[PDB]
Each structure stands twice: as C-alpha cells, then as structure tokens.
Design a protein around this ligand. Structure first.
Ligand code: K
Ligand code: K
Ligand code: K
Ligand code: K
Ligand code: K
Ligand code: K
Ligand code: K
Ligand code: K
Ligand code: K
Ligand code: MG
Ligand code: MG
Ligand code: MG
Ligand code: MG
Ligand code: MG
Ligand code: MG
Ligand code: MG
Ligand code: MG
Ligand code: MG
Ligand code: MG
Ligand code: MG
Ligand code: MG
Ligand code: MG
Ligand code: MG
Ligand code: MG
Ligand code: MG
Ligand code: MG
Ligand code: MG
Ligand code: MG
Ligand code: MG
Ligand code: MG
Ligand code: MG
Ligand code: MG
Ligand code: MG
Ligand code: MG
Ligand code: MG
Ligand code: MG
Ligand code: MG
Ligand code: MG
Ligand code: MG
Ligand code: MG
Ligand code: MG
Ligand code: MG
Ligand code: MG
Ligand code: MG
Ligand code: MG
Ligand code: MG
Ligand code: MG
Ligand code: MG
Ligand code: MG
Ligand code: MG
Ligand code: MG
Ligand code: MG
Ligand code: MG
Ligand code: MG
Ligand code: MG
Ligand code: MG
Ligand code: MG
Ligand code: MG
Ligand code: MG
Ligand code: MG
Ligand code: MG
Ligand code: MG
Ligand code: MG
Ligand code: MG
Ligand code: MG
Ligand code: ZN
Lengths: 252, 102, 58
RNA sequence: CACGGACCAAGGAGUCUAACGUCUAUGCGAGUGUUUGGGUGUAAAACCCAUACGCGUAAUGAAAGUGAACGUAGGUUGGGG
RNA sequence: GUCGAAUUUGGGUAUAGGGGCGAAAGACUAAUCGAACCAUCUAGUAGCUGGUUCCUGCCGAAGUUUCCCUCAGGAUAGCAGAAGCUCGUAUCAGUUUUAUGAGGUAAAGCGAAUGAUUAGAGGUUCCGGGGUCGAAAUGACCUUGACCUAUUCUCAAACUUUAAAUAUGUAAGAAGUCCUUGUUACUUAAUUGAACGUGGACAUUUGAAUGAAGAGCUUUUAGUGGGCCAUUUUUGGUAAGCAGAACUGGCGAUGCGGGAUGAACCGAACGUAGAGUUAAGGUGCCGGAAUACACGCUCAUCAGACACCACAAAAGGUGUUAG
RNA sequence: GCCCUGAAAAUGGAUGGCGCUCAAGCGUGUUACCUAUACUCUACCGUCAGGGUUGAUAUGAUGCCCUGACGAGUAGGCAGG
RNA sequence: GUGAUUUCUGCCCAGUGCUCUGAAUGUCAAAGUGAAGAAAUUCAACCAAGCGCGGGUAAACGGCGGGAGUAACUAUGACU
RNA sequence: GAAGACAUUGUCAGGUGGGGAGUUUGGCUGGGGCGGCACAUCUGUUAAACGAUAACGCAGAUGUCCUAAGGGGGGCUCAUGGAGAACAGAAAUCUCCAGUAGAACAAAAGGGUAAAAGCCCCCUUGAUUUUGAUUUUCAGUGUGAAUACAAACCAUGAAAGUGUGGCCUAUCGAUCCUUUAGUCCCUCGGAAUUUGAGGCUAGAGGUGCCAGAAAAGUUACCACAGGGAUAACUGGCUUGUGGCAGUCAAGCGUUCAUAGCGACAUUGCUUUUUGAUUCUUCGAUGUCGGCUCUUCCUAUCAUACCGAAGCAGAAUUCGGUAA
RNA sequence: GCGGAUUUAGCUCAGUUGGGAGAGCGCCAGACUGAAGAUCUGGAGGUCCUGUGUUCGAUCCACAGAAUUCGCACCA
RNA sequence: CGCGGGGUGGAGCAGCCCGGUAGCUCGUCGGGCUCAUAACCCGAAGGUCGUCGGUUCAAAUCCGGCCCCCGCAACCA
RNA sequence: AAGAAAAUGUUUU
C-alpha cells in the first residue's frame, strides 16, 4: 500500500547526487572549426581527483582561437597522460595517447576513451576508470565507424565523433575489497544516497513486493515483466535467464 | 427421453382448429439481437466508467433445461410450443423400444 | 445462539379471546363451483320464469 | 457478586414540514376550494372578486378505442321505521 | 553497551499524508501513525447500548403463524385499545344430552399375517451332508442343520386381526315438513328429472339440556414477534436447575395468606373501610391458636419431624411390633 | 411397620430456631381453635349499565335523582384532569 | 537475492513466472475492405499486439515421492 | 550537425496492468470453526387413534426416468411349493396340481391393485386447445402438485365408458432482460408506405441460500457497536467417565467361598478427574505453576489404643475408635 | 489413560463358511555330477498367544486377559 | 454459450490432410541364432478403428449428430 | 582415404 524505495528515488529529494566537491562536468572541447579541419594543442596543467569518480581528471588549457584568452577543459585523464604534456585535438592530430581524434581518422584496433555517441556531445562512452572503446571498423561511404563498447556491445557511430586515444586512468580500482561497511559508506557519501540497502524480504508487505510472510521469502518469481508498472519492478527486471552464469558471452 | 416426430395434435390456426399432423422439432432460442430495447439500454448503461452495471448470474444449480417441442402443422404451418419435463438426454429420432429382446 | 423452534402454547387462548366464530350461514348460498352447463340453463330458466311471472301480473 | 447513579441547582429528549390512511367536527354540496393574482384597507390583519386551475361528477383497455335503464333502475330472502 | 569514525552534535536546507522518510521496528513523520494534524461535508449511518420529564380512571397483551442475505431486525396473521355502526320479539356457546360419523393411540395379539424368539415332540435318514459300521449303498442307526406337522416360552416407534378412554365432524326445524303446478337453451325414451319459482296446510313444548352484562358488523392503530415454570403425555441424553415437542394451568404482567426463605407450588387474585366466616397452613415457646382427646408404634454413641423441596439404595439385625 | 447397620468432605450451623422422647416424633381417628387484599353483610369512592325527571319559584337536562353490577396489571391504547 | 573467511553450492524447466522462434493462422478490437439490402443494418473475408504453440531459464518462485522384481540363512537391495 | 514525413503529439480501439481504487468474501449450528443440511422437498415413525406439532430425532428418499414406463381395449395371472419329463443337476424348458398376492407395478417408503393397476398383444397421442373454479402448503398470497367441471378437437373400445401424462403420496422457479410461438391485432403521437422498434397472450433461457444479491482471503498491527441472547475460569445442576465403597458368592487360597482375595452380576457414595450444560459474569471477578501462610475434611501414611490372620518369634497383612 | 488393529510349521505370510491347518524361504531326501554347487522334482513340518465360554466336537462360532505396535489426550 | 484437440490390438502410438485400407513398439507365446546364457532376429495370438445414420464404388480416413476426456474464447435473466 | 555390433562361462580333480 506504500510507495516503495525505488519509486521514491525518482522524486530526487534525498537521492540527488552529492556534487559539491566535483571539479565540473568532464567534457571534450566543443567541436569547432579547428578540431573539424586541423588540430589545436592544449597543455595538461593538473591531473586531479574528482569526488565520486574513480578516474582522475585532466585540466587541459587551450588557447581560444577567436579571442585572446585561455579556455580550460576538464578531460578524463587517460592512463599515461602527465602534467605538462601537450594534447592535440582535431582531425589532423597524431595517434598519440591523450590526443582527441575523430573516430574515422584512426585505424582499426585503436583504443579510445571518452567517445562521443554523436559528433559534438563531448564524450559519452568509455569514461569510467579503466574502460575503453575499440575501433573495429569503418564504413567510409555513409561515414560510420563500428566500435566495441566496454559492455561488449557493438555500436555504429558517426565517423566525426571524437575520442581520446588510450584507456581511462584509474583502472583496477574494483579489484581491491572494500573490506568495510565504512569504506562503502565513504564511497557512497560522495556519490548519492543509495547505501546501505535494506532487503525487500526484510520489509513488510506494505513497503515492498517482497515484504511480509512468516518466513523471509519472495513468494513469487523475482523475474519481473518488462511491461510491469512502477511499484512492481523489484527483483530481476525482464530477465532473460537467472542462476549462476555458466557458459559464454558475446552471443552470435 | 425419446419423443417421436409427426405429432397428430390440435391446431389453432383458425383454418384447421382441429387435430392435424404436426412436425416436431426442438426449439432453439435464437440470436440475441442488438436494437432490442433491453440490449440498447444495457449497452448505454455499460458505456463509460462504472464497470459492470447489471448482475451476472453465477450460482447455477440446474443440470438440465426444459425441452420445448416446436409443433408445425403440416397443413397451415401454424406453430405451437409444448414444454416437456426436465430430461438429461433428449432425442427426436426413432429407434423405439422393443419388448422381449435379449 | 439457539432459540425456541415452535409451540402452539397460548394459541387456543388467543383464538378463544375473540372466539371461534361459526361461519354466519346465509340463505341463497353462492353458486361459485356449480357446473356451468347447469348454470347456463338455470339462467335461461330463471329468465323465462321472470318473463312468465311478469305477464302473470294481471 | 449485572449496568448508571457521591450530592445539589439550572438545562435536558416524538418536534416542525411536504404528501398521505382511518376517524371526527364544520361549511357548502353535484359541486367544492376567496388569499397565484386583482380590488380594497383603520395596512403583513379584516373585507371583496374575474378567469382559470385542482379534486369530484365515468369507467375500462397495453393501446387504437368504446363507454353505463328490458324492467316502477330488476327478482328473491331478511330488514328499522 | 560504546567512546576517534557507518562517531556525537548546533544551525541552515530538502523531502508532506496513501505522501515523506525507514542500516526495516509497520518504525518515525511535534506526547498523534497498520495512514499525522486542522476545518468542512456532518446533527454522516447504526437491525446495536443508554436515556426518554405530571396525576388519576377504564380496558389490556405478546414472545406464536407465513415470508424475508431472516436467526439481536422487519413485513404478515394473531393477541390489545379506540371509534363506533345495524339491530335487540334477540342472537349465540372453550358445556352437556340425544342421534349419527371419523380415528388406529393405550391396551391387547402372536397355537392370527410380517418381523423377532426358547424348547421339546412327531415325519422328510429325499434330509446339506457327514460320523459309524455297512464289502459298498444311506442300506440300518446317531447326529446337527434345516424343511413339514401339531405344540411351547418371550417380543415390536417405523408389526397386526381386535381395539378403548380423552379428544373430534355433523344434526337436533318456519331458511322446517309436506302438497298443487309454472320456466329452461340443462336432462330424460318420455312432464322423466334437476334447479328455481307461483299457490296451500301446519306457533302453548317453534320441536333436547344449561347459560346468554345481548347479538351481529366495520374501520383503524399500539405493543409483541428472546420466553420460562408446574401436573400429565412425550423425544434425544447416564443424567442435568439439560436440550426439544403435546394439552392445560400459570409466572412474565401479581400483590395478598401459607410452604422459614424462594417468579412459577398450595390457597386465593387486589378500589377505601367495618364486622363476621373461612381457604391453604397451623395451634409447646418463638407465634395468633388445645403442653386437646383417642388407639398404637419408635429410644437412634449420626432418632424423627409434612407435598413441590432441598436426596439416599441394594443387602442385613432373637432390637421391638404385628402377621 | 418403626428403629438400627449399611451411611465418607472440606468456615461453625441448621425439622426455620429453641427445644421435644406414653413427644412438641411416626401412622390413624375426633373435635375445638387461629387467621388472607378470598366468601357474606353494611357504608363510602369510582366505572359501567338500565332507567326517572324540562309541568312550574328550576341559573348547574354535560343537571338532579333511582336501581344493579363491577374494580389485579407490565408493554400498550384511550379518557378525565 | 545471499550475507566475513574456509569448503561447497547436487538433481529438476512438468507447474507459476520471466524471456526468445515458427507463423502455407489457431484465437483475433477499432478503422478499413467486399457482398446483400431502400437504408438503418446484417453477413463475410482480412485481421496488430497479446494469448495459444515451440525453445531457453532455478544464486527465478519453487520441488526433490511412491510402487514392483532382484545377492545362495534371513534382512536389505549395488542391479533392473 | 542529426532525423524526417518516420518519431512525436491528439482521439478512439485491443492487450497488459494488486502498482493503485472501490467492493464483496451466505445461513442454520447445544459458542464459533470443520463436518452435515435438519435451507426447497417426499415416505414411514417419533406424534400422545380429528387436524397441527420440535430437536444437528430415528429408517430412508428427491433435482431424475419414460413415445411408453402416457391413453384406450382385449386376452391372460403373479411369488412360491409339490408331483412329473433325455442331456438337465439344487437353478435353464415342458406338464399338472395348490397357490389372497407370500409377485409385479421406473425409483425411497407407505398406501392401492387379481377376468387388474400386474404380464402379453392391438390401436394410438388426453403428455392437445381455451380460459375459469377448487384441494394441500396458506397470509386462506405466490409457487409446485393435484381434484371436478365447462367449451373444443381427438384416441380407444362393440359399447357403456375411459383418457387434460406417469396407480396415489416428491421430482421444482418471480420482477427486469432475452428469446420463441400466437394475434396480422394496437403504437411509433404533423401525414403516409415499407423496414425496424415497441406493446398484447402463451412458453423457454434461473435464481438448489430453492418468495429468487452479482462477490476471494488474511489480520499475532488491528478498530467500532454490542453480546453474558454466546465460547475460553470458578461457582450451580448432573455424575456418563474418573475416584471411592457395598451386596451375592462361582472360584483362588494344599483340604476351606468369605484369614486374605474374588468372577458373573448388581446397589451405591464422592465432586480432589474429565465431560455434559450454558444459569451468573463480556460498561472486565486479573488466566499456569511455585513460594508464603492459615484453617478445614477424612476415604488414616505415621504416632496412641485395640479386634482378626493362612498372628510361633520377628516382619507383615485385614479391620475398628481416631484428624 | 483411551480408541484401534496383529497374534498361525524354524523365519515371512494366506486362512476359516459352527471345516481344514497351507504357501514360499528354511530343513531332509530324490534326480543330476567324477564328486559337488546351482537347477530341477518331492517330503516332513503346527498340539493356531493364554484362560473360560456355547456346542456332538472346535485355531477358527464367540467372551475377558497378555504381548507387538499404531493413533488420540494428560497446565494455563 | 461457441470453437477446437482427440478416442484405434492388454498398454502406449502411426495411419486421416481428399478412401484400395487397420499396422509399430512394449507386454504374452513359440521358433531361430550361440557350445550355452544374455543381447539380437522372426513368426503367432491379440482391435476391425468410441457410437449412430448418410455421402459415397467401398469409409479408421469424409459429412451431420450422440457418449467420454482435455483445452481455449465470450459473458445483463 | 577409412569403414558397425560381439557381454558372460560356478568349486575341485
Ligand atoms: K514475502
Ligand atoms: K457506466
Ligand atoms: K520448471
Ligand atoms: K518453466
Ligand atoms: K493491479
Ligand atoms: K478485507
Ligand atoms: K459416578
Ligand atoms: K466477561
Ligand atoms: K576340492
Ligand atoms: Mg544536483
Ligand atoms: Mg549489497
Ligand atoms: Mg541488505
Ligand atoms: Mg520485520
Ligand atoms: Mg504489495
Ligand atoms: Mg507480485
Ligand atoms: Mg518473521
Ligand atoms: Mg455514449
Ligand atoms: Mg468505454
Ligand atoms: Mg423466537
Ligand atoms: Mg450473586
Ligand atoms: Mg451494559
Ligand atoms: Mg458507578
Ligand atoms: Mg429542570
Ligand atoms: Mg510485524
Ligand atoms: Mg440525533
Ligand atoms: Mg382488567
Ligand atoms: Mg438486547
Ligand atoms: Mg400413527
Ligand atoms: Mg403397546
Ligand atoms: Mg419481558
Ligand atoms: Mg399469582
Ligand atoms: Mg421450606
Ligand atoms: Mg375488606
Ligand atoms: Mg399463643
Ligand atoms: Mg430394607
Ligand atoms: Mg438412618
Ligand atoms: Mg409446632
Ligand atoms: Mg398424631
Ligand atoms: Mg346513564
Ligand atoms: Mg385497574
Ligand atoms: Mg556464513
Ligand atoms: Mg473489426
Ligand atoms: Mg499476431
Ligand atoms: Mg485492493
Ligand atoms: Mg452463523
Ligand atoms: Mg394426527
Ligand atoms: Mg384388462
Ligand atoms: Mg413441492
Ligand atoms: Mg372428457
Ligand atoms: Mg394421476
Ligand atoms: Mg421461467
Ligand atoms: Mg419483451
Ligand atoms: Mg413524431
Ligand atoms: Mg427462501
Ligand atoms: Mg447465559
Ligand atoms: Mg469449557
Ligand atoms: Mg463409575
Ligand atoms: Mg436454554
Ligand atoms: Mg462494574
Ligand atoms: Mg477489577
Ligand atoms: Mg477481586
Ligand atoms: Mg474413619
Ligand atoms: Mg547337487
Ligand atoms: Mg537366447
Ligand atoms: Mg572359468
Ligand atoms: Zn394447422
């Protein structure tokens, strides 16, 4: 009879992200004439920690081509990028780690990061620590690039979409056990109010579909239809299968 | 029960008004028509919000229905109706009883 | 919570308070159930008797 | 050894209305109802009034419709006076 | 318990009621939480609980019938009041008698039917066959079982020939008995009959008894629709101050005298008084009234002492009494 | 027949109590006596009923008067106050 | 969902769920189409998803019985 | 830059949708539940010889079945027994005799029935039409069932007659809606025709909770109105059961019924068992046990004093007065 | 405590109608073998749990006990 | 109310989809194979196809019902 | 180029 927790999250009162300490949105440069036709050289001034983000950010300063001033950009630092390094962004930039190139300007097998889903969105794909996108092919006519995403999905993107050569820094982060409720607490204190999590079976029927009973148990299948409604989508939503995953991925 | 056809019985057809031969059939209700005033009223009542607006009978107890014979006079075609007692198996065809069979 | 089921107790006393009334016999009882053929002929006979006694007044 | 009641004062519960059944009183009576309204006034009173309208004087039928004296408005039995 | 981090805490800020918030207790959300508070709808509805305000006079119930999503309610009939009305040369009646029906309970019956049921006897050894011989039969016995015959003991709510008592229908006149002959489309072979008529005779007991604050008629409404008790009939139950019926009388609704006491038992029902007499019950004293009269019986180291009723049995006793 | 044995329950206690032994017990018989709101008679109240009396000084005919019977009451009805 | 570590997580997809095929289609709305009719209308074909059918899935919900026979004392059955 | 008449958006339509809303989730009842149906009914009995009459009384039955197992007629006579006839015996078919029904009649039971109501055969559709009256249940409403006629048309028989379903007593269903038959009748209201619709009369599709709502749970989170009309204590009635005690005395006890026991029976007491009941208490009598403490009972374990013994002593057993 | 059931050749079971007592397995023999084992044939095997009970008799007609167990109850 | 899937040797099934016609496996029995046993191979028995009519030259096969079982769709007395 | 199935046999002489 009560609005369940996953329903309450959408109102965004206490479930908003804790963004106070964050350095700013990590984005590529705005796609401009210099990047569309040649390249522009920036300088990596600082490699800094972003609160709530595993990957470090790189503050990169470019000259403004149209006004005498500097423009600071917040890239997601690729591993091996250092302070004082010159970053080259544009169609004519070299195939060096940290450079920002259009997807169509790199050969097959290139490893890129912070890849734009569309040209000029300034980076959407392979942004988390240790992640990267692989260029697996080009279709020059109707200019598109086929890429492999961290999840293993194959995606077709415009060849004018940009990416940073290399892998996002900070990889291996999840290999260390948190070892402590307090460490999970401090992790999520800087992300959002999603921790700790009460099990639905530990609640009452009013609070959750899984609540109630003289034993803790789901009672009905935890696999929930894709067409179910809000307040019903607790458990395994639209699960194709359940159980300990035995077998191969990358289905043909 | 076994009821024969051909039924010589009274006819009220205003031309016979007397015992004539009748053809016997089993009466079937016939399709419920739209545009019957009750159906029109029911559809209008059902339209919109409010859900089901009239009873839907559920507590069925009868296991039979009363068989109605339609008696059509062979001369004037006037039809009469005769209700029988409740029966579980009704047949109009022949195969009459035989006495002394093994 | 069960209760009493039936009794005729006090019923004869109630009946006799206003008494068992005999059914007030009348001369010329009604002809309600009489055979209709007899009634038809009786009507014709009575009409004929009435006409005869009307002419008999001299 | 069921419930309310320590005590006292004051307050405290079948009312009014619309439409009705029976009965009764009254007026008039095949009619009845002046009071919507009008006239008038000593001014929310009293007094006066046309046309309608309501009920009644006719019933019956789903309806179209039809529509109440053979007779001293009947015969018989009883019937107060 | 914990006490240096999932720590404690101020202030600011956000989330608001089928909403929030919840390290999850249905916890917390201003002493309010399995849905806050405030106002209004709202005097919400209640077959349920409580209350319901002066006097006297007269009459005076029901807890039963039928129907109901009915079983703590209602409708309906009944019981009750009121208003009367038409008559009163009068009618009827919780009654008897006489005449005439109906009944299948009590009882009775089972050498009468059905069904139970004890025993012996006489025949089917064909008996159901066996035992035993019989060389072997049933051949001869015995047998247990049945069958048949005449007997015999005992039974029946769902057996019965018979068959009460109580209870019960009808009649006991003038709307009667009889006689003559008119109508009909009914009926008859037919004025044959049927029914209804016209005319005529029959009042002291007009056709048993007793009674009759009269009889008949109508309208309209109240309450009630939990009952219970006693004698008798009676069902279930070991039984019950149990549960369920029949008839009547009661209590409820009722005081009074008696049973010490007590709703129901006995007696008797009630305006205010006086006198007399009684009922039931009593009369040593409490306590009004004989420590009356009479014939017996009883002695109890648990005597007994008035029905309902407030308990006692089988079995025993040279106690004592009478047979 | 009476008495006794049979005959054991919890606060101290009940032929009602006291007490009673040719009873003040049990069975039976005869009288006298006591006393209910009952019965009889009388008065008074009311109710109901049947009657008399508009013939005068008559203002109370809803009055006055005569006669007889009757009186319990919850729920409830009605009446007069 | 489970609940440090260690060790291990068996069998079962028939059911209820969840999730993907084949549609020489079964079910099948409104609109649309055809016929009949003076029309209202009726009838018919077509007919989306869904359902149905088929497949997958249990660290989804869950389930994990019974009987028969069979070892050279018996018993029990490794076995069928 | 992408995208493109596709998304989107608007309306309708199908699916999905406890996420959410609203609601419901019988009755009787020896508390309620579970069970059952005593809820609509029928036979016999309870039932007390008119009628009526209750219980979750007793023994059973009903929601069907039948074109004949309805209607008419004719002929015949059944169960069973005995005596006979190849296979054939205890049972097959044939014969006679006896045969009051001991058979059969759809079903439960009761009644009824012998030239039949049964068995067999022949002909049939009265299991029809019209609308009334009547009996039972009963309010003298409905429904079901049934009775006797009338007015038709028929069946059967030589005929008188009989037949308006089943030999009788059970076998069933309102309003509204739908549907069919009938009337070719009424209406569609400015006037017509034709469709369509609506009426009038009779049926049918159904309510079994059977006078007839359309309806799943859970609450140990609970709420309210109430109920001692009603359960879970004590108390009260009862005392089956429990416990305790008698009588008789077949037997046991080597012999001997009774030292001590005691079968088959049978009479009781008690209320420290458990039931049965539902009278008190539901506007509340604090719900186990223990601890503590007092008192009472005696059906006495011990102690006192005794009687008996299958009492030599010792030990023991039975019993008495004794709390 | 109460209500049920089972008491049977050595072991596991069927009985029976007011009769008997059988089946397997076991055991003893015979076929078979050089001799055996198996496999085949056979045979013997109970005084029917105990006491009384009606009978002409009786495991069985038909009663009270003992055991072996199944189930229900024993404080609110 | 409607529409489907069916029903076939003792058991479980094919055959139907436009009729030359009833078979398969398991189970029973017998035979063969092997030196012998098991496995294996074959044959026999076992049903006339749920039922009643019809279309048909002749029906398991088609067409209408009837019985039984299962499933699905629809829902004002 | 290559070519399915084939289990078992009591103890002591
Ligand atoms: K749960
Ligand atoms: K609506
Ligand atoms: K599964
Ligand atoms: K599945
Ligand atoms: K839902
Ligand atoms: K609920
Ligand atoms: K007892
Ligand atoms: K209480
Ligand atoms: K050897
Ligand atoms: Mg923000
Ligand atoms: Mg977690
Ligand atoms: Mg958790
Ligand atoms: Mg919890
Ligand atoms: Mg929920
Ligand atoms: Mg769910
Ligand atoms: Mg729990
Ligand atoms: Mg509309
Ligand atoms: Mg709609
Ligand atoms: Mg009552
Ligand atoms: Mg008291
Ligand atoms: Mg109270
Ligand atoms: Mg008080
Ligand atoms: Mg006052
Ligand atoms: Mg909880
Ligand atoms: Mg009020
Ligand atoms: Mg009185
Ligand atoms: Mg009350
Ligand atoms: Mg009788
Ligand atoms: Mg007798
Ligand atoms: Mg009372
Ligand atoms: Mg009295
Ligand atoms: Mg007394
Ligand atoms: Mg006096
Ligand atoms: Mg004195
Ligand atoms: Mg004695
Ligand atoms: Mg004594
Ligand atoms: Mg005295
Ligand atoms: Mg004396
Ligand atoms: Mg007077
Ligand atoms: Mg009085
Ligand atoms: Mg663990
Ligand atoms: Mg369509
Ligand atoms: Mg589709
Ligand atoms: Mg809900
Ligand atoms: Mg109930
Ligand atoms: Mg009677
Ligand atoms: Mg005859
Ligand atoms: Mg009936
Ligand atoms: Mg006739
Ligand atoms: Mg008849
Ligand atoms: Mg009907
Ligand atoms: Mg209609
Ligand atoms: Mg018009
Ligand atoms: Mg009813
Ligand atoms: Mg009580
Ligand atoms: Mg109790
Ligand atoms: Mg006892
Ligand atoms: Mg009672
Ligand atoms: Mg109190
Ligand atoms: Mg208290
Ligand atoms: Mg107290
Ligand atoms: Mg003693
Ligand atoms: Mg050997
Ligand atoms: Mg072989
Ligand atoms: Mg070898
Ligand atoms: Zn005709």
């Amino acid at each position: 009879g009560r609005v369940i927790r996953n329903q309450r999250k959408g109102a965004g009162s206490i479930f908003t992200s804790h963004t106070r300490l964050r350095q700013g949105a990590a984005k590529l440069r705005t796609l401009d004439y210099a990047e569309r036709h040649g390249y522009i050289r920036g300088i990596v001034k600082q490699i800094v920690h972003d609160s709530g983000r595993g990957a470090p950010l790189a503050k990169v300063v470019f000259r403004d081509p149209y006004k005498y001033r500097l423009r600071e950009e917040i890239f997601i630092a690729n591993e091996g990028v250092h302070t004082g390094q010159f970053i080259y962004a544009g169609k004519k930039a070299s195939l060096n780690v940290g450079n920002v190139l259009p997807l169509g300007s790199v050969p097959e097998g290139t490893i890129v990061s912070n890849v734009e889903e569309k040209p000029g969105d300034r980076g959407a794909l392979a942004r988390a620590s240790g992640n990267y996108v692989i260029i697996i092919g080009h279709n020059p006519d109707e200019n598109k690039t086929r890429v492999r995403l961290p999840s293993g999905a194959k995606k077709v993107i415009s060849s004018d979409a940009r990416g940073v050569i290399g892998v996002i820094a900070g990889g291996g982060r999840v290999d260390k056990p948190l070892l402590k409720a307090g460490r999970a607490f401090h992790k999520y204190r800087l992300k959002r109010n999603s921790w700790p999590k009460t099990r639905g079976v530990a609640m009452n029927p009013v609070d959750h579909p899984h609540g109630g009973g003289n034993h803790q148990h789901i009672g009905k299948a935890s696999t929930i239809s894709r067409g179910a409604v809000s307040g019903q989508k607790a458990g395994l939503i639209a699960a194709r299968r359940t159980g300990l995953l035995r077998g191969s991925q990358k289905t043909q | 029960v076994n009821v024969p056809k051909t039924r010589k019985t009274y006819c009220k057809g205003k031309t016979c008004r007397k015992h004539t031969q009748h053809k016997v059939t089993q009466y079937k209700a016939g399709k419920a028509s739209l545009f019957a005033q009750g159906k029109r009223r029911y559809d209008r009542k059902q339209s919109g919000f409010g859900g089901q607006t009239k009873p839907v009978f559920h507590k069925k107890a009868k296991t039979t229905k009363k068989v109605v014979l339609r008696l059509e006079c062979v001369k004037c075609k006037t039809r009469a109706q005769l209700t029988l007692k409740r029966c579980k198996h009704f047949e109009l065809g022949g195969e009459k009883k035989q006495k002394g069979q093994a | 919570a069960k209760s009493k089921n039936h009794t005729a107790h006090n019923q004869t006393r109630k009946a006799h308070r206003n008494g068992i009334k005999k059914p007030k016999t009348y001369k010329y009882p009604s002809l309600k159930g009489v055979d209709p053929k007899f009634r038809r002929n009786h009507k014709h006979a009575l009409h004929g008797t009435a006409k005869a006694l009307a002419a008999a007044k001299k």
